[PDB]
Amino acid sequence: NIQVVVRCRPFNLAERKASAHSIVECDPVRKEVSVRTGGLADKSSRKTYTFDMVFGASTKQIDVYRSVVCPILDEVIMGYNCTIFAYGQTGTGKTFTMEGERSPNEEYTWEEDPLAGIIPRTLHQIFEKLTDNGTEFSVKVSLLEIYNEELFDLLNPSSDVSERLQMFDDPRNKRGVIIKGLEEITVHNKDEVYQILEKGAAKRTTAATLMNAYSSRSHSVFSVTIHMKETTIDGEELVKIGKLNLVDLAGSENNINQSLLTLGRVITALVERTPHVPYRESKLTRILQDSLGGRTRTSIIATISPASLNLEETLSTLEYAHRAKNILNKPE
């Protein structure tokens, strides 16, 4: 089965000032999320769901990274392909989890910032893990985004954001795709990481000015490819190639998002064991086909809100994530 975990965000200043009370309780021991759905103080109804891990509102980024990402990175380094999705309502912390933010007032360098998310920590950690173990390696990254079923490259320095890319089937791979023109940027060392991310964020701002509600309607796929070579005591070369996809999905909230609709239908087909799985009906599912019932090791981080206002979308996210637990992949 694929791994599914839930992370609740903390209340913001607005909500605190209103003296909001959380409707979500996370029990990491029981690995349970419980949501208050109705009823007064002294008596209530709840809905409860069990996941692979649960992370309550006070969970820090480093603890998400250690619990979830560390083991996945180790499998990437062994030469497996892995994907982590963030799924949930706009405003629940998909981008916070996958990217993170900067601590205010230049308190930290990027490497040491506690608010850093999965992407920067991962890139930083690859260089640390492979520092002097006998494995020669290179790291390449791309950042592809999908908005209104069009493809954009958020790292090509010499293309304007608005040039769409074209996708084709990869002839040497049944079910693989080729994305014509997608830039892969070589990351030569840890000191090259930040400015690469910065250039991405700058292209994203241009995108947002151009395309309506870009940040909530777009899907983004940040790919890290690690090409590895070991030499044995007899001078034989051993090759390993690991790929990690870190995906920040469109907001799940209730205009037409074909890729998000098709993801849900792919999940349904897989869990119901329907023989036709509709991968080909969107760009997102064609690109990530191998992550959904394929040979990639997959995790989903489902993000939720503590706030009573968000009750129905929270329940929808939890039901969707709980169903996805039944997806079966066959890694390597």
Ligand X SMILES: O=C1CCCC2=C1[C@H](c1cccc(O)c1)NC(=S)N2
Summarize as ranges the residues that interact with ligand X (CB under 6 A).
99-102, 110, 113, 115-117, 119-120, 197-198, 201
Specify whether the CB–CB gap between 151 and 167 falls below 8 A: yes
Subset of 73-112 contacting ligand ADP (CB under 6 A): 88, 90-96, 101
Pick between residue 62 and residue 210 the one whose CB is nearest to ligand ADP.
Answer: 62
Q: What is the CA radius of gyration of the chain?
A: 20
Contact partner at residue 93 from ligand X, ligand ADP, Mg ion, none, CB < 5 to 8 Å by partner kind: ligand ADP
Rounded to whole angstroms, the Cα distance separating 274 from 206 reads 41
Q: Which one, 101 or 170, has the nearer CB to ligand ADP?
A: 101
The sign of the CA dihedral 26, 315, 287, 93 is: negative
User: CB–CB of 56/303 below 8 Å?
Assistant: no
274 is in an annotated binding site: no
Closer residue to ligand X, CB minimum distance, 83 or 289 = 83
39 annotated to a ligand binding site:
no
Question: Looking only at residues 7 through 26 of this chain, which bind ligand ADP when binding is defined by CB under 6 A?
Answer: 9-10
Measured from the CB atom, the residue of 51 and 152 that comes closer to ligand X is 152
Q: For residues 85 and 87, what is the distance between their CA atoms, to the nearest angstrom?
A: 6
Give the CB-nearest residue to ligand ADP: 93
Angle, CA 79 vertex, CA 76 and CA 84 arms, to 5°: 30
User: Dihedrals φ, ψ of 200, to 5°?
Assistant: -55, -50
Rounded to 10°, the helix 118-129/193-210 angle is: 160
Among Mg ion, ligand X, ligand ADP, none, what does residue 197 contact (CB within 5–8 Å per kind)? ligand X
* 257 is a site residue for ligand ADP (CB under 6 A): no
The site for Mg ion (CB under 5 A) is made up of 94-95
